[PDB]
DNA sequence: CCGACGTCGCATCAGC
DNA sequence: GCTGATGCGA
DNA sequence: GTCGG
């Protein structure tokens, strides 16, 4: 409805973020985006807007511009602009922040092509993400999802069948389509109070995992692909998270979503004296001060804990 | 007016 | 060599 | 850039 003011403030998100760095105006202009991307009417000026959370009085200022004359001149300038339109377009390659492309273009690496005949400048991070540049920003079909999901809870009950794992995020939810995989894993010899390496090690075997992004004690970041003389799949981008059995709710809570519902969630909890991190839930005592944590075997305990009726992830973009 | 705005695991760098 | 900081993508 | 104490 709005496409043309929700594009520009994206737009002018990303360049906050990659060149100017100013990470707290991205998440401004996001917020503006997404406020307006909700509203069901078609904004007739930036008053209009300002009436939403989010919208302020520059942000007022520029719908009324782009409204008057279909363009922001600040916009049509800094997309002319080689060396800004350069730095913000190499902030698309994985491991490529606003940092290193600043520095590539400083000394005249401005495109992939040219991040493919600077190979020994790039980290190992960033090389993968060079690799797979165009595969990164596909989204991947639900039925991809679950063949992935198929192999990686096969593969983790076959290294021990105590492995408890879950896909959480958007294909936990029920999504049509999934921009990643987020694996959350847990053992029942693993509290608070080789794991990993061994799921990681095996889903290697298979080939299934294919290159390694970052991997520790709790967390892996990596590549994958289902098996293909049918044309092959994209690789994509998977998350092993190992998390301590007393925390493992919390964490898939969290790591289903969606971010707004996650924010409620978490609000509701506080005006009803509990706090809700990825890791515990715990009490506000009489004057702010958290208690312990309080034991979670599901997710339902916590809902229980606040009085919200169990939520299914499909009901739960908010 | 003026500070908050999410917090953290891992890879790698910067300082010693 | 070791420790803390910073970049990055969550 | 926006919000709010
Ligand atoms: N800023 C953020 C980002 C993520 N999250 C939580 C809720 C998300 O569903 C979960 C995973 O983040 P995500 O993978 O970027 N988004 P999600 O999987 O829901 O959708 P897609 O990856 O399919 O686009 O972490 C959050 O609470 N605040
Ligand atoms: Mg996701
Ligand atoms: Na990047
Ligand atoms: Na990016």
Known sequence: LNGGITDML???????????????????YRKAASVIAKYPHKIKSGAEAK???????????????????????????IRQDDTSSSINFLTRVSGIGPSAARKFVDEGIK????????????????????????????????????????IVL??????????????????????????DMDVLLTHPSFTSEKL????????????????????????????????????????????????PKDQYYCGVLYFTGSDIFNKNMRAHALEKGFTINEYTIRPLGVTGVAGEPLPVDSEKDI????????????????
């Open 51 to 77: 009436k939403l959370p989010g919208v302020g009085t520059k942000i007022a200022e520029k719908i009324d511009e782009f409204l008057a004359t279909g363009k922001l001149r600040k916009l049509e300038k």
């Open 196 to 243: 990993l390496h061994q799921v990681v090690e095996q889903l290697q075997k298979v080939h299934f995992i294919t290159d390694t992004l970052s991997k520790g004690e709790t967390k892996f970041m990596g590549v994958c692909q289902l098996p293909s003389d049918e044309k092959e799949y994209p690789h994509r981008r998977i998350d092993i998270r190992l998390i």
């Open 111 to 150: 495109t992939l092509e040219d991040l493919r005949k600077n190979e020994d400048k790039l980290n190992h991070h960033q090389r993968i993400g060079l690799k797979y540049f165009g595969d990164f920003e596909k989204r991947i079909p639900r039925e991809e999802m679950l063949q992935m999901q198929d």
């Open 154 to 179: 096969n593969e983790v009950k076959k290294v021990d069948s105590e492995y408890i794992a879950t896909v959480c995020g958007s294909f936990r939810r029920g999504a049509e389509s999934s921009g």
């Open 303 to 318: 809902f229980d804990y606040i009085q919200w009726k169990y939520r299914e992830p499909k009901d739960r973009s908010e």
């Open 10 to 28: 994206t737009e002018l998100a990303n360049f906050e973020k990659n060149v100017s760095q100013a990470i707290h105006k991205y998440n401004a």
